[PDB]
Design a protein around this ligand. Structure first.
Ligand SMILES: [Ca+2]
Ligand SMILES: [Ca+2]
Lengths: 119, 119
């Protein structure tokens, strides 16, 4: 669920507020289309695509599905308890949190004018 | 489907781009939280709530479900040939596009500081 994805980001990126990601690029929050502005925004595009695959599993609502995971040392693990929807959504979240940590963050790409930059 | 929602917004508010409603206030655009900043933002809050209720229908994905509707001279009508998901989503979209057409659009409420204004 969204609370868990926030905690995962707090985990791989302890240096930033989750809000730093919630309105980044064309894909991290609003918009959800156009050309990814940089690698971090591409992380978000992939996450969106991952959730879209997850939602095919009926009843599977990635933002609301609670899964089982652990954050240790900075290393996310999805547990083996998870049902199909949980396992899939946890993996999406995990992969995005790792991706966020590895991508450069550009302040110029926070709260961008989506209309101007995401066509 | 999202493209149809954009087309409904163009049906009722052809003076504007759908992008104008893609990140407005705390609620217009993906996600939403905090206190609605104005009437237009209240429309978006009710549209997210409506989508929330439509998502209770099994397999119902508002952003992807293609429905049947008509835009006739600025009037929107959801047609009879919609299954439950389509009918619900169509109605959400129709009611929001009408609500948007009645609300004043304030440029200082476009692409706001979400962290500062929406908790
Ligand atoms: Ca924004
Ligand atoms: Ca919204």
């Amino acid at each position: 669920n969204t609370y868990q994805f926030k905690n995962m980001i707090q985990c791989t990126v302890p240096k930033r507020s989750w809000w730093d990601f919630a309105d980044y690029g064309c894909y991290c929050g609003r918009g959800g289309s156009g050309t990814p502005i940089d690698d971090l925004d591409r992380c978000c595009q992939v996450h969106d695509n991952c959730y879209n695959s997850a939602r095919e599993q009926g009843g599977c609502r990635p933002k609301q599905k609670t899964y089982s995971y652990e954050c240790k040392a900075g290393t996310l693990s999805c547990s083996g308890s998870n049902n199909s929807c949980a396992a899939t959504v946890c993996d999406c979240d995990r992969l995005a949190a790792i991706c966020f940590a590895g991508a450069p963050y550009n302040d110029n790409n926070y709260n961008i004018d989506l209309k101007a930059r995401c066509q | 489907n999202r493209w149809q929602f954009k087309n409904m917004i163009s049906c009722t508010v052809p003076s504007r781009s759908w992008w104008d409603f893609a990140d407005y206030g705390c609620y217009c655009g993906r996600g939403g939280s905090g206190t609605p900043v104005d009437d237009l933002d209240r429309c978006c809050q009710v549209h997210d709530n409506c989508y929330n209720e439509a998502e209770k229908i099994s397999g119902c994905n508002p952003r992807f479900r293609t429905y049947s509707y008509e835009c006739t001279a600025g009037t929107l009508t959801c047609t009879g040939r919609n299954n439950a998901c389509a009918a619900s989503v169509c109605d959400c979209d129709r009611l929001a596009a009408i609500c948007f057409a009645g609300a004043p659009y304030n440029d200082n409420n476009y692409n706001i500081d979400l962290q500062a204004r929406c908790n």
